[PDB]
Amino acid sequence: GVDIRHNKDRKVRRKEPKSQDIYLRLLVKLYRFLARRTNSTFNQVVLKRLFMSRTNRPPLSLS
Amino acid sequence: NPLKNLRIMLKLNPYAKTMRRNTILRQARNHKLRVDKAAAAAAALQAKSDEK
């Protein structure tokens, strides 16, 4: 036996969109490739935002 | 395992070959000296007993 604690082993985060929108899934595929095959941290942030729920993607006003 | 596999040890520590070679050469030299020294003692023991 090992003296460790297993309550935080599984990190709770979005690994994919919960949506079934096939157009969202296609450009998730595109940004999954660009995040992996580039060093751009911009593509990483955009990819994880594509996974997010609607409440985590609030609208942006023009102003 | 190193310490059991010679080439694996030489991959991690190339100087282990010359230490091992020096040890094997040294131990053979020391063993030969102790053998010849002991034979001389027996030869002197035989000479001092059968000197006539």
């Binding site: - | 010679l6 091992r20 070679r21 094997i24 050469l25």
Partner: protein, 240 residues
């Protein structure tokens, strides 16, 4: 090109040479042997012959496959060892020297005492407890399945024939050409036949081993008898 040389680095332990890198550099005279700077026809042209057939034909060798299986197996990785059996080093126990009396533990010659002659190329021992003594011909045996006794005869300066090799003693088979389904019994030739050559070789070796056996008293009686375990005796207390 130049004539090959010996290693010039004596081995003292397996994997370690006696001389170092710089010592071998000077032994090889690498200071003056310094170098800086300075196929198979797949297709064959053949005269096809015949009028207005063109000149020749560019006939290729190893035509492409006529058929492909629906799926294949990926090739293996590489193992840097695992030599074939013919290239294995053959090890022999120190108690088995030419002329040693051995005890057979398996086979129809179970428990018989035979004379060891030489180790063959496969590591199988060649023995002949002489046929006039215990009915053991020139025959191969495995060193793992014999007991090396202490008694020996000096079979030096005897001439074991050179054709006595592993190929000589390898078993021969008949079945099964020109026959697919068994409706007539193919039990013929099941009688193994002793070749005249095997009898000649048996006589040749035994003619020069037997006088050396008779040289020491009642060894032939020892070779005629078989080994057995009496109820009082235990193999771990026995000196062989």
């Amino acid at each position: 090109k130049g004539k090959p040389h010996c290693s010039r680095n004596p081995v003292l332990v397996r994997g370690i040479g006696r001389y170092s890198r710089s010592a071998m550099y000077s032994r090889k005279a690498m200071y003056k042997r310094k170098y800086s700077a300075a196929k198979v026809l797949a297709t064959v042209t053949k005269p096809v012959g015949g009028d207005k057939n063109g000149g020749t034909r560019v006939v290729k060798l190893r035509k492409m496959p006529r058929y492909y299986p629906t799926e294949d197996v990926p090739r293996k990785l590489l193992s840097h060892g695992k030599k074939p059996f013919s290239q294995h080093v053959r090890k022999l126990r120190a108690s088995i020297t030419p002329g040693t009396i051995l005890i057979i533990l398996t086979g129809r010659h179970r428990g018989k005492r035979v004379v060891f002659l030489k180790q063959l190329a496969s590591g199988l021992l060649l023995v002949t407890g002489p046929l006039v003594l215990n009915r053991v011909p020139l025959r191969r045996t495995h060193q793992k399945f014999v007991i090396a006794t202490s008694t020996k005869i000096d079979i030096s300066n005897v001439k074991i024939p050179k054709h006595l090799t592993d190929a000589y003693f390898k078993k021969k088979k008949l079945r099964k050409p020109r026959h697919q389904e068994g409706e007539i019994f193919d039990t013929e030739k099941e009688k193994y036949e002793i070749t005249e050559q095997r009898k000649i070789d048996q006589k040749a070796v035994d003619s020069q081993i037997l006088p050396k056996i008779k040289a020491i008293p009642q060894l032939q009686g020892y070779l005629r008898s078989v080994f057995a375990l009496t109820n009082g005796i235990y193999p771990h207390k026995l000196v062989f």
